[PDB]
Amino acid sequence: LQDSLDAGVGNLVDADLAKESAKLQSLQTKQQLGVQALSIANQTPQTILSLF
Amino acid sequence: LQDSLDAGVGNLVDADLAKESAKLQSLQTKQQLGVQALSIANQTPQTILSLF
């Protein structure tokens, strides 16, 4: 019964790490893509300076 | 919400400078033409001296 209760605790709280590896690599790509998009959005306003 | 309020203040007060460049160049040309027209208007009266 104690082994069953420990297995139930593990079923209740434990994460599935094998899916987390793919989620981690995808988020690591997404964060750099977001940094690049933010850099381009920062660059965008300054083109007005060429008009003067 | 703070970002939305900042965007609304910018929508309210901010100028569109890309039109301002054209307005500035046209206003400079208009100022030069106005100085020329004022110069001719100053010159006009003094032709009376040829009659005497």
CA-nearest of B17, B3, B6 to A46 is B17
A47–chain B nearest CA distance, Å: 10
Helix/strand/coil percentages in chain B, nearest 5: 90, 0, 10
Chain B residues with beta carbon closer than 8 angstroms to that of A51: 17-18, 21
The 3 state secondary structure assigned to chain A is: CHHHHHHHHHHHHCCCHHHHHHHHHHHHHHHHHHHHHHHHHHHHHHHHHHHC
Task: Give B46's DSSP letter.
Answer: G
Residue B47 and residue B52: Cα distance in Å, rounded? 10
Q: How far is CA A47 from the centre of its chain?
A: 32
Which contacts qualify for A35-39: CB closer than 8 Å, 24 or more apart?
none
CA B10-B15-B21 angle, to 5 degrees, is: 150
Chain B positions touching chain A (beta carbons under 8 Å) = 17-18, 21, 24
Give Cβ neighbours of residue A52 (< 8 Å, ≥ 6 apart): B17, B21, B24
Q: What is the DSSP secondary structure assignment for residue B25, as one 8-state letter?
A: H
State how far the Cα of A36 lies from the Cα of A30, in Å rounded to an integer: 10
Q: Which of A47, A35, A7, A44 is nearest to B21 (CA)?
A: A47
What backbone torsions phi and psi does residue B16 show, to the nearest 5 degrees? -100, 95
A-B interface: how many C-beta pairs under 8 angstroms? 8
Interface of A to B at Cβ within 8 Å reads 48, 51-52
Q: Which of A2, A19, A4, A50 has its CA nearest to residue B21?
A: A50
The experimental technique used to determine this model is cryo-EM
Which residues lie below 8 Å from residue B21, measured CB to CB, with a gap of 6+?
A51, A52
Judge contact between A48 and B18, C-beta under 8 A. Answer: yes
